[PDB]
Amino acid sequence: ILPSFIEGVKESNPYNKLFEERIIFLGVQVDDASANDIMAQLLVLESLDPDRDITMYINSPGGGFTSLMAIYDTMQYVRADIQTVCLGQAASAAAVLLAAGTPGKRMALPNARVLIHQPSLSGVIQGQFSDLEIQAAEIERMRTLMETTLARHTGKDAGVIRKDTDRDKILTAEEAKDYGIIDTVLEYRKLS
C-alpha cells in the first residue's frame, strides 16, 4: 500500500523522496538482495555528494552475516558519515548496522527496540564432522567478528559483548543508548 505518483519521467513514490534526501531505507530483512540494494544506494549517495550525511533507517529483523558485513563494510567505506536511525526494531544483524553509524549520529525512536544476539545457523547444516568442524569454526568466527564489530562501535570489550549476546538481549532505546548502540534517543518533534 504505497502512493506512487507515476510519471516518460521519474515515478516518485515516498521511498524516492527518502532517497533524494539521502535516506537509505533498511526495513526488510538483511538477506543478500537487500544488502545488495543498500550497498548500491550507499555508493550512489556517496557519488552524489560524499560530504553530506547518508541517513540509514533501520526497521529490520536482521538477517545473514555476510549480507550484514556487506552493508557494514559499505557503510564504513563511504566518505559520507552514516546516520543510523532505528525504527521499531534493529534486531540481529540490524543492531550491528545500527551501531555502525557515525558516532554522534546513531539515533533511535523512543519505542524502538534493539535486539542483539549471537549468530545462528538457519536450519541444520549437514555433513561429515570435518565439514562441521569448518562450519563451526566459521560461526565462531562470525560470532567473534560480530563481537569485535560491536566492540568498536559500542565502546565495550568484546568479552562483554560475548556475555551479553549469549542470549537474545533486547534493549529499548534508552537501554541501547546506555549500551552504546545508539547515541541519542529521538525526542518527539510534534508542535502539539
Binding site: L43, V44, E46, S47, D49, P50, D51, Y77, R79
Partner: peptide, 14 residues
C-alpha cells in the same frame, strides 16, 4: 568523472 563505487575517486567538495 563523477566517480562512483569502491576504489573510485569521488572528490569531496574540499
Amino acid at each position: 568523472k563523477r566517480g562512483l563505487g569502491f576504489g573510485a575517486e569521488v572528490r569531496s567538495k574540499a
